[PDB]
């Protein structure tokens, strides 16, 4: 839908669902397999964390808020 | 029901000891796997925020 | 500075499942011993309604008695 | 049978230790899965709302 809010929300949900199952999965299945999984999981979680940080800068600041937009619309209505 | 068949309890105690030891070994295995997974995820992403890792190491 | 809702972690090593529970519970030498008694029983006797005794155990006038019943020798 | 019982009567310690150790792990086992289930439940329902 090309919306900033949708992308940010989606990333958080994947982390919640992806990490809850993974910790349980680690407990579930026990040499070679345990070590590789640790890296594979850490990798994804790390990637998601980096993505979240990138997303916050993009959103607009406190200035030029909704009230200001309405004010802008006023002058525009006369035009 | 173990006496019903007829056998000394030493074998049963040996079996209990070996099954408890097997449970202890698999618990130790899962513990060390989650410990090494924690260590590898900690060291893998040490660069995301150095201050957070410093505070984590200080608090421990 | 501080993160939201930090708290104190528990005492460094209390009772866990990561310790050797048997050696802490003083049961090591019994295991190191351990790792048929009917046969043990067999050595004392001969061999080892055995169907009847089990059923009796599943649920769970000595002088006068001798005088009362007489068994023919031949 | 009585002799076997009275011989095991002093050998009732190690079996009890093994049983309680197995129960501890079993009792603990319900706890880890329950925590995992709660996390799984939250993602499925709480996130959607």
From Swiss-Prot, chain A:
GO annotations of cellular component type: core mediator complex; mediator complex; nucleoplasm; nucleus; ubiquitin ligase complex
Domain of life: Eukaryota
Subcellular location: Nucleus
Keywords of this entry: Activator, Nucleus, Transcription, Transcription regulation
Listed GO MF terms: DNA-directed RNA polymerase activity; transcription coactivator activity; transcription coregulator activity; ubiquitin protein ligase activity
One GO BP: protein ubiquitination
Subunit-structure text: Interacts with PPARG. Component of the Mediator complex, which is composed of MED1, MED4, MED6, MED7, MED8, MED9, MED10, MED11, MED12, MED13, MED13L, MED14, MED15, MED16, MED17, MED18, MED19, MED20, MED21, MED22, MED23, MED24, MED25, MED26, MED27, MED29, MED30, MED31, CCNC, CDK8 and CDC2L6/CDK11. The MED12, MED13, CCNC and CDK8 subunits form a distinct module termed the CDK8 module. Mediator containing the CDK8 module is less active than Mediator lacking this module in supporting transcriptional activation.
Recorded family membership: Belongs to the Mediator complex subunit 21 family.
Protein name in the entry: Mediator of RNA polymerase II transcription subunit 21
Originating organism: Homo sapiens (Human)
Swiss-Prot record, chain B:
Highest taxon of source: Eukaryota
Compartments it resides in: Nucleus
Subunit structure: Component of the Mediator complex, which is composed of MED1, MED4, MED6, MED7, MED8, MED9, MED10, MED11, MED12, MED13, MED13L, MED14, MED15, MED16, MED17, MED18, MED19, MED20, MED21, MED22, MED23, MED24, MED25, MED26, MED27, MED29, MED30, MED31, CCNC, CDK8 and CDC2L6/CDK11. The MED12, MED13, CCNC and CDK8 subunits form a distinct module termed the CDK8 module. Mediator containing the CDK8 module is less active than Mediator lacking this module in supporting transcriptional activation.
Protein's job: Component of the Mediator complex, a coactivator involved in the regulated transcription of nearly all RNA polymerase II-dependent genes. Mediator functions as a bridge to convey information from gene-specific regulatory proteins to the basal RNA polymerase II transcription machinery. Mediator is recruited to promoters by direct interactions with regulatory proteins and serves as a scaffold for the assembly of a functional preinitiation complex with RNA polymerase II and the general transcription factors.
Family listed: Belongs to the Mediator complex subunit 10 family.
Name used for this protein in its record: Mediator of RNA polymerase II transcription subunit 10
Organism for this UniProt entry: Homo sapiens (Human)
Lineage: Eukaryota, Metazoa, Chordata, Craniata, Vertebrata
Residues represented out of the complete protein: 69 to 128 of 135
UniProtKB/Swiss-Prot annotation, chain C:
Family as reported in the entry's similarity comment: Belongs to the Mediator complex subunit 19 family.
GO cellular component: core mediator complex; mediator complex; nucleoplasm; nucleus
UniProt keyword S-adenosyl-L-methionine present: no
Chief location of this protein within or outside the cell: nucleus
Record's keyword terms, sorted: Activator, Nucleus, Phosphoprotein, Transcription, Transcription regulation
GO biological process terms on file: positive regulation of transcription by RNA polymerase II; positive regulation of transcription elongation by RNA polymerase II; positive regulation of transcription initiation by RNA polymerase II; RNA polymerase II preinitiation complex assembly
GO MF, one example: transcription coregulator activity
Subunit text: Component of the Mediator complex, which is composed of MED1, MED4, MED6, MED7, MED8, MED9, MED10, MED11, MED12, MED13, MED13L, MED14, MED15, MED16, MED17, MED18, MED19, MED20, MED21, MED22, MED23, MED24, MED25, MED26, MED27, MED29, MED30, MED31, CCNC, CDK8 and CDC2L6/CDK11. The MED12, MED13, CCNC and CDK8 subunits form a distinct module termed the CDK8 module. Mediator containing the CDK8 module is less active than Mediator lacking this module in supporting transcriptional activation.
Disulphide connectivity of cysteines: none
Location(s) in or outside the cell: Nucleus
Protein name: Mediator of RNA polymerase II transcription subunit 19
Keyword Transcription: yes
Gene: MED19
Curated annotation (Swiss-Prot), chain D:
Gene: MED14
Domain of life: Eukaryota
Location relative to the cell: Nucleus
Record's protein name: Mediator of RNA polymerase II transcription subunit 14
Quaternary data: Interacts with GATA1. Component of the Mediator complex, which is composed of MED1, MED4, MED6, MED7, MED8, MED9, MED10, MED11, MED12, MED13, MED13L, MED14, MED15, MED16, MED17, MED18, MED19, MED20, MED21, MED22, MED23, MED24, MED25, MED26, MED27, MED29, MED30, MED31, CCNC, CDK8 and CDC2L6/CDK11. The MED12, MED13, CCNC and CDK8 subunits form a distinct module termed the CDK8 module. Mediator containing the CDK8 module is less active than Mediator lacking this module in supporting transcriptional activation.
Tissues where this protein is expressed: Ubiquitous.
Function description: Component of the Mediator complex, a coactivator involved in the regulated transcription of nearly all RNA polymerase II-dependent genes. Mediator functions as a bridge to convey information from gene-specific regulatory proteins to the basal RNA polymerase II transcription machinery. Mediator is recruited to promoters by direct interactions with regulatory proteins and serves as a scaffold for the assembly of a functional preinitiation complex with RNA polymerase II and the general transcription factors.
Stated family: Belongs to the Mediator complex subunit 14 family.
């Amino acid at each position: 839908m090309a919306d900033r809010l949708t992308q940010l929300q989606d990333a958080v949900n994947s982390l919640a669902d992806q990490f809850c199952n993974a910790i349980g999965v680690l407990q579930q299945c026990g040499a070679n397999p345990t070590e590789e999984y640790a890296q594979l999981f850490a990798a994804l979680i790390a990637r998601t964390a980096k993505d979240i940080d990138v997303l916050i800068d993009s959103l607009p600041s406190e200035e030029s808020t909704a009230a200001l937009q309405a004010a802008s619309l006023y002058k525009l209505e006369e035009e | 029901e173990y006496i019903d068949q007829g056998r000394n309890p030493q074998l049963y105690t040996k079996e209990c000891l070996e099954r408890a030891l097997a449970k202890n070994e698999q618990v130790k295995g899962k513990i060390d796997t989650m410990k090494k997974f924690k260590s590898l995820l900690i060291q893998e992403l040490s660069k995301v925020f150095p201050e957070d890792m410093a505070k984590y190491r200080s608090i421990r | 500075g501080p993160f939201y809702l930090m708290r104190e972690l528990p005492g460094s090593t209390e009772l866990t499942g990561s310790t050797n529970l048997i050696t802490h519970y003083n049961l090591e030498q019994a295991y190191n011993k351990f790792c048929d008694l009917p046969g043990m029983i067999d050595l004392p006797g001969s061999h080892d309604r055995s169907l009847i005794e089990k059923p009796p155990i599943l649920s769970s006038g000595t002088m006068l008695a001798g005088f009362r019943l007489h068994t023919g020798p031949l | 049978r009585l002799l076997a019982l009275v011989k095991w009567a002093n050998n009732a310690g190690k079996v009890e230790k093994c049983a309680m150790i197995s129960s501890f792990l079993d009792q603990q086992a319900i706890l880890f899965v329950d925590t995992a289930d709660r996390l799984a439940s939250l993602a499925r329902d709480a996130l959607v709302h």
